[PDB]
Amino acid sequence: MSYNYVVTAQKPTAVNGCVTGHFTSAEDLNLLIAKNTRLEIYVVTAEGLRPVKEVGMYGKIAVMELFRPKGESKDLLFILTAKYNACILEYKQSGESIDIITRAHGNVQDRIGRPSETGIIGIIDPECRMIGLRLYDGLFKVIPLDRDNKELKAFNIRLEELHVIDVKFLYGCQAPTICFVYQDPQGRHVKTYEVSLREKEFNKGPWKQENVEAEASMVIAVPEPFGGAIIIGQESITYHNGDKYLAIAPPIIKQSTIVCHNRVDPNGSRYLLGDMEGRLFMLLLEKEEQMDGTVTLKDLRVELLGETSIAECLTYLDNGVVFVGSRLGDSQLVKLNVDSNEQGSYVVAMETFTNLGPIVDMCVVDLERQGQGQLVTCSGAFKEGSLRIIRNGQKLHIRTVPLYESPRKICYQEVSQCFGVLSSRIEVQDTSGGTTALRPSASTQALSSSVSSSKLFSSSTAPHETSFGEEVEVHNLLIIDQHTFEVLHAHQFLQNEYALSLVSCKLGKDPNTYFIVGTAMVYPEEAEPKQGRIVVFQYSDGKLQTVAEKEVKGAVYSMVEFNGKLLASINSTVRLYEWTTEKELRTECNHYNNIMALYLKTKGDFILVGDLMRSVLLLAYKPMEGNFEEIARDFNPNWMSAVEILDDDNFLGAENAFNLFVCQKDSAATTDEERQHLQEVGLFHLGEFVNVFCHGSLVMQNLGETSTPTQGSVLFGTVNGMIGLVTSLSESWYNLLLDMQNRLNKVIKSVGKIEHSFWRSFHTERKTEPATGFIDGDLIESFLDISRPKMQEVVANLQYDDGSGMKREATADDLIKVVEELTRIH
Amino acid sequence: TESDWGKRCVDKFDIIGIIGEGTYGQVYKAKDKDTGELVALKKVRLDNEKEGFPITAIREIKILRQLIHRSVVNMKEIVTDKQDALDFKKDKGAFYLVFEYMDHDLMGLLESGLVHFSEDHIKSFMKQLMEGLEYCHKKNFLHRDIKCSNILLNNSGQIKLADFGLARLYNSEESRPYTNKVITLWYRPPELLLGEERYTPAIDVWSCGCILGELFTKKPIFQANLELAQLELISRLCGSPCPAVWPDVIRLPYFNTMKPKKQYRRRLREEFSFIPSAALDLLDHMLTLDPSKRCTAEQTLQSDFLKDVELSKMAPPDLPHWQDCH
Amino acid sequence: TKPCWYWDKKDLAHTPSQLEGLDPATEARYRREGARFIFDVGTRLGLHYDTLATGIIYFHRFYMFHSFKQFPRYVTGACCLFLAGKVEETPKKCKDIIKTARSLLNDVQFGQFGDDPKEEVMVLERILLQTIKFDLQVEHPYQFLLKYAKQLKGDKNKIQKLVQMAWTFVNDSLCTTLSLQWEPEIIAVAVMYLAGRLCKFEIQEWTSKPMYRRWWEQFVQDVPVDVLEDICHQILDLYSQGKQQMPH
Numbered sequence A: 001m002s003y004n005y006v007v008t009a010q011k012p013t014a015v016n017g018c019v020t021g022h023f024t025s026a027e028d029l030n031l032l033i034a035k036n037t038r039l040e041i042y043v044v045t046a047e048g049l050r051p052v053k054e055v056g057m058y059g060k061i062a063v064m065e066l067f068r069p070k071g072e073s074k075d076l077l078f079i080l081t082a083k084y085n086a087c088i089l090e091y092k093q094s095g096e097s098i099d100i101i102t103r104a105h106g107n108v109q110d111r112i113g114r115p116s117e118t119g120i121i122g123i124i125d126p127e128c129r130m131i132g133l134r135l136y137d138g139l140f141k142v143i144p145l146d147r148d149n150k151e152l153k154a155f156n157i158r159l160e161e162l163h164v165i166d167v168k169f170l171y172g173c174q175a176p177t178i179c180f181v182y183q184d185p186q187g188r189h190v191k192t193y194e195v196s197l198r199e200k201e202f203n204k205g206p207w208k209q210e211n212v213e214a215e216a217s218m219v220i221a222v223p224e225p226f227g228g229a230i231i232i233g234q235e236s237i238t239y240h241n242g243d244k245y246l247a248i249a250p251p252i253i254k255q256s257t258i259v260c261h262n263r264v265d266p267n268g269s270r271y272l273l274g275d276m277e278g279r280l281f282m283l284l285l286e287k288e289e290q291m292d293g294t295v296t297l298k299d300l301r302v303e304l305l306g307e308t309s310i311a312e313c314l315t316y317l318d319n320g321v322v323f324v325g326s327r328l329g330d331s332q333l334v335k336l337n338v339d340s341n342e343q344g345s346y347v348v349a350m351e352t353f354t355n356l357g358p359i360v361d362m363c364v365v366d367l368e369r370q371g372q373g374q375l376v377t378c379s380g381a382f383k384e385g386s387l388r389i390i391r392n393g394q395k396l397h398i399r400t401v402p403l404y405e406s407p408r409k410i411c412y413q414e415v416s417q418c419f420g421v422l423s424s425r426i427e428v429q430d431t432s433g434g435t436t437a438l439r440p441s442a443s444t445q446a447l448s449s450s451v452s453s454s455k456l457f458s459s460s461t462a463p464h465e466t467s468f469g470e471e472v473e474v475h476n477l478l479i480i481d482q483h484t485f486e487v488l489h490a491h492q493f494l495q496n497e498y499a500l501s502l503v504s505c506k507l508g509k510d511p512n513t514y515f516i517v518g519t520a521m522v523y524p525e526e527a528e529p530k531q532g533r534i535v536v537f538q539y540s541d542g543k544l545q546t547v548a549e550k551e552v553k554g555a556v557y558s559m560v561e562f563n564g565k566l567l568a569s570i571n572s573t574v575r576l577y578e579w580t581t582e583k584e585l586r587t588e589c590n591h592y593n594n595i596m597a598l599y600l601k602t603k604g605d606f607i608l609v610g611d612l613m614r615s616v617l618l619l620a621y622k623p624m625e626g627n628f629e630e631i632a633r634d635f636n637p638n639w640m641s642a643v644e645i646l647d648d649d650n651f652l653g654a655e656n657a658f659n660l661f662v663c664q665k666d667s668a669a670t671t672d673e674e675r676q677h678l679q680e681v682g683l684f685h686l687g688e689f690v691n692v693f694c695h696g697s698l699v700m701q702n703l704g705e706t707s708t709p710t711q712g713s714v715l716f717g718t719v720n721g722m723i724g725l726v727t728s729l730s731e732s733w734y735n736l737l738l739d740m741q742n743r744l745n746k747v748i749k750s751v752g753k754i755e756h757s758f759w760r761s762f763h764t765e766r767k768t769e770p771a772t773g774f775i776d777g778d779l780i781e782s783f784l785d786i787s788r789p790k791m792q793e794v795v796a797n798l799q800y801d802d803g804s805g806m807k808r809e810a811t812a813d814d815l816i817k818v819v820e821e822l823t824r825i826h
Numbered sequence B: 001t002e003s004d005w006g007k008r009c010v011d012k013f014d015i016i017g018i019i020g021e022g023t024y025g026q027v028y029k030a031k032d033k034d035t036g037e038l039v040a041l042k043k044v045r046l047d048n049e050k051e052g053f054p055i056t057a058i059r060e061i062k063i064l065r066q067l068i069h070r071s072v073v074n075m076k077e078i079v080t081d082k083q084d085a086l087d088f089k090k091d092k093g094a095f096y097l098v099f100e101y102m103d104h105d106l107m108g109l110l111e112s113g114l115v116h117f118s119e120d121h122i123k124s125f126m127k128q129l130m131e132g133l134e135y136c137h138k139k140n141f142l143h144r145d146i147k148c149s150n151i152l153l154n155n156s157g158q159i160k161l162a163d164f165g166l167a168r169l170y171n172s173e174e175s176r177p178y179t180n181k182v183i184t185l186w187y188r189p190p191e192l193l194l195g196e197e198r199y200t201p202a203i204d205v206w207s208c209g210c211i212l213g214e215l216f217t218k219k220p221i222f223q224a225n226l227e228l229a230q231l232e233l234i235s236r237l238c239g240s241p242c243p244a245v246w247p248d249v250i251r252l253p254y255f256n257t258m259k260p261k262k263q264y265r266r267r268l269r270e271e272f273s274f275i276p277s278a279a280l281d282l283l284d285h286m287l288t289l290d291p292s293k294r295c296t297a298e299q300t301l302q303s304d305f306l307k308d309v310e311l312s313k314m315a316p317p318d319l320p321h322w323q324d325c326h
Numbered sequence C: 001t002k003p004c005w006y007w008d009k010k011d012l013a014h015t016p017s018q019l020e021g022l023d024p025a026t027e028a029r030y031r032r033e034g035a036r037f038i039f040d041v042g043t044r045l046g047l048h049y050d051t052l053a054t055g056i057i058y059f060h061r062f063y064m065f066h067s068f069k070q071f072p073r074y075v076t077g078a079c080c081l082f083l084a085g086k087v088e089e090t091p092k093k094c095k096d097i098i099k100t101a102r103s104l105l106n107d108v109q110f111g112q113f114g115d116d117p118k119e120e121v122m123v124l125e126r127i128l129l130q131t132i133k134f135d136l137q138v139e140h141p142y143q144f145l146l147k148y149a150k151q152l153k154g155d156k157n158k159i160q161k162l163v164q165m166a167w168t169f170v171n172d173s174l175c176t177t178l179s180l181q182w183e184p185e186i187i188a189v190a191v192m193y194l195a196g197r198l199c200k201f202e203i204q205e206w207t208s209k210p211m212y213r214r215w216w217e218q219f220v221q222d223v224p225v226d227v228l229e230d231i232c233h234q235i236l237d238l239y240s241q242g243k244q245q246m247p248h
């Protein structure tokens, strides 16, 4: 068996959802911000936000909504996790003591159902009579909000429309009514139903179905003064309400897809809209009052306000202040002004909250020769693209290098006192027949620049037609100085050439240090690329020189230096190249039992291959023969997102289901089959998507640091900005810490009353197993924050073993010291 | 000639790797040196010398040289390790069952979650599987181990049945006692959970229905670790075993012994309301508690869901692409 | 695709056993002993008639590719029965076959099994499988005797006498090389023909074509009477030489 320990070094920073309301007091205006597994509660002031409380939940927050049922003084909070844990929460404060009450809870998972394409949707009735959940295709789940439903028991209503895009409860209806957009072979439609809690079924809805835009994406429920709904698409915005129908199709929105909406005026007069290029719009409902005294909707208007960060959630707070919740870039507070500034913008940034964004790749480098190590991360996407330099000093110090294009891979080249970074920017087919960039970015603002003139694929004779307005990716290699972080050079790869892999190393007997990039020719027609290049660059005297190129018949997904040779994965093949005295790459040996060799890692003459579906394989280079040999395969099926080698026997992997596992050589030489079998000895639901595993540590090493119980250091980056650390433990220390977890879980009160053991259970849609071989260090590190009565309760009847003390009792002061040492690994 | 098996050597194949672990010996992927065709060589080890050549292999060598169908896997030949020269007693070399190499298996395509099945694709998957099963059932053979890992798939969309290790002949006239609890618990029929030991070909049908549902839900329908627990889950959806629905349930050994918590009513149509009507009927008939009332393979093929499916329009499933990895 | 398991009578002059100096009478004596050994061992173990026959067919085929003087007849027989049990799903443990073989064989005969009987047998399984070219499925005259008899309608007691007498002729033919000369379908007809001539029955009337004097044809196409007579002659010769006489 294997024993390992996982801790968070940086909590998730990306904003997954944000709501406003009156949650902490019936008087205050709150802002609840949801980051993965994290809930942040703020109070709105005239300058900004006053933090009041933050809690963690044992689950990914999928639904977050505030509501106030009749009889309550203040809003209650509904949360549903991605594993379908539902709960209703209440804020309670006793002087200085703040706690979160679990008023109702339960797990709403169905034994049989198909998870929907557009994900979990949760909505609440305007009269707070019920919670609507869209969890499975063809089903609508209703949790009725009666006082007695403390277990959140629910029933399903059969839904004929199998493919639902979005649904909202409507305002101004005689019965609870849902309005939704759905898709069938004839296009997309908008339709309504009434929900009867008494009959537990749908009844005919208030207004007829209407055919809507093919890419109708969001349903805005309009308030009582107007009633009805608004449907947002790619080209048009429409208003529907019985006999009333409006449609505005302003050309400005066609340019970028709109992803978020909010209400600025409680009466529905004004809504806020945002798009994937960062633009912020105001949607205006122009009123017309009839002599009847009734109020109708006259027209819709869209007005461009300015630019914000690409925002997952918008929420208007008060006065001119809007909170911009960003998942791809840094989140913001911005103020909307009545008068535009001299550039024509009504939006002026106030504060900028740090979001490590998606961490596509990262490396650890000791820039200042301190023995510490700093983390340079490829963070963000598109306009929010950034390099983030992270050091420890008690908080983490983070520096941001704006790139305004997407960073993909990073590698450090000490000889040249610089970094190599692969990047891609979006250009659009323009009337010249070429393309034009939406904004200047790192690859365009380099000091010196080059473009590849390779004639490898120039024979072509393969037609690829271009339509005006279509997007294209333009990939580049950036040379960036390690002190100034100024773009020194930019190399633009071939048209339709995507850069996938990057290494910096010396090869063979060649004393020069090179940047080597693996690329793939990508055309929309191909399911899998069939052409590629491995390019050898030398950065010298401010210029990048192309030393050699090797053509491959696939995509160079991953490369890694292997004892003076270049190990590259080209689609199904894993290949080892030698670097000749003529400065050309030469094939030596190959491996072909791979579906798609996405990830590669080396230790000694051992190689770890990460396949798309068939999990990890431990190849070995056999120098006596000049070829590879299969040491062992993980026969169980897991889709990989990143892999890493822990030691000569243990291997770490990440699943696309937010799961981690550790494979080991079965170390039993009885039968050849046992050695060729890797047994998954560690299982752990991380709750985050691991993109990059990287050996190193951010802790300052003065050589005086007490040797911690933990051995080894792997940092990992995730899509939500969370940075974590994996390390190994001795059998004794694991048993101690594991036994302590079980004691801590009985003592610590979970928000939503979610069992910790369930949360960390390895969970795929088709398999769910208990966690094994992993210590949730974030649980262990919470021992230091629980009250003294609880600490002593935990240590009762705790014994040590496998050491000088075969049986040794623990006291609350002993464990405080142990955990405090465990907090010093990050 | 092509028919003299057991003499050609495994030298003729370049071994590519290991594709799986075997109940009797490990399976390797390989390329034929002469033709370039990709094969999958199963290792058959007689070195144990406990009962000699495994009977499981003997059933795969006996049945698969009889069964010819587009939906049943092909045993191309049997090849051997370099045999010891003129010393059969010292010889402990092993034998290999050469099969066609099928690109993917259903367990891996659904478990990675990368596969997306449309209705028409499911029709083509099921139509082939049932046609294969019908061929086998008509020849009076019972697979007895239908599983998602045993339904191999080529990228073209061709499906082939695969693991004939537990297969045996069925005699309608003579109810000879066979082994028991043959299919894996998740895909096991209710009768074998109650232990009939005189089983009908309808055992394989139950499994295929379980697969039909799993293709729509992307999650196996009846997942349990204990035989009674499986009966409960099946009982909740398909209804509790009771004399009205299963007149002969009282004759089954464990009917009094193994009981569901309640006498649950059948809810299949309700819980599978999202499944198309043509298919939902097929599931109700395939997942029928009484083996005598459970539909046959031919009946499944003469179906509104499957009858008018044309095997010419294979329509490959949405298998992973490079953008899908992205 | 599939191998040819049938030879011409003239070809049996050129088996490995013959060419190593064994005369025709001895090889046929050795075949009867080995087949009867297989039959007697398996009958003591309670084995189905198909299992006994499958072993005997393996045995006969084996000594068309191998010699009798270099490969012992009783070890081979035991090995054949052992494999037959696994093929026909009537399995037996090798130790039990040895036990029974010892019970039935004298000390000289059991000397063939050598110092370690189980080992000599289990080792041979490799050669057997390669020799029979892994063609394990075998059809036997029994199933056709019943399939064809089921289509006869008439006096219940005259047909049941025909069947049993023919069934006995099938059991007897296993001692001969007929299994190597004619498909099982022909054998079943030949034994129906032989029993009919002896019982002075006219099988043509029991058929659906009472007037089709060549009734074998509605069961087995392209079978000349010349074939059926050759088979009858070979079966009847066994009764002539032995003390056993026609059952009737």
Ligand SMILES: COc1ccccc1CCNC(=O)CNc1nc(NCc2ccc(-c3ccccn3)cc2)c2ncn(C(C)C)c2n1
Binding pocket: A593, A614, A633, A635, A636, A637, B018, B019, B020, B021, B022, B027, B040, B041, B042, B073, B099, B100, B101, B102, B103, B104, B105, B152, B162, B163
């Ligand atoms: C320990 O247990 C397991 C648990 C889960 C998953 C797998 C196993 C092993 C037993 N699985 C097996 O052995 C799989 N049977 C299988 N798969 C075939 N082609 C599909 C296939 C399956 C697997 C891979 C593959 C490649 C690399 C890595 C992993 N898998 C590739 C193609 C195939 N063609 C012909 N035959 C005949 C010899 C029966 C085949 N048998």
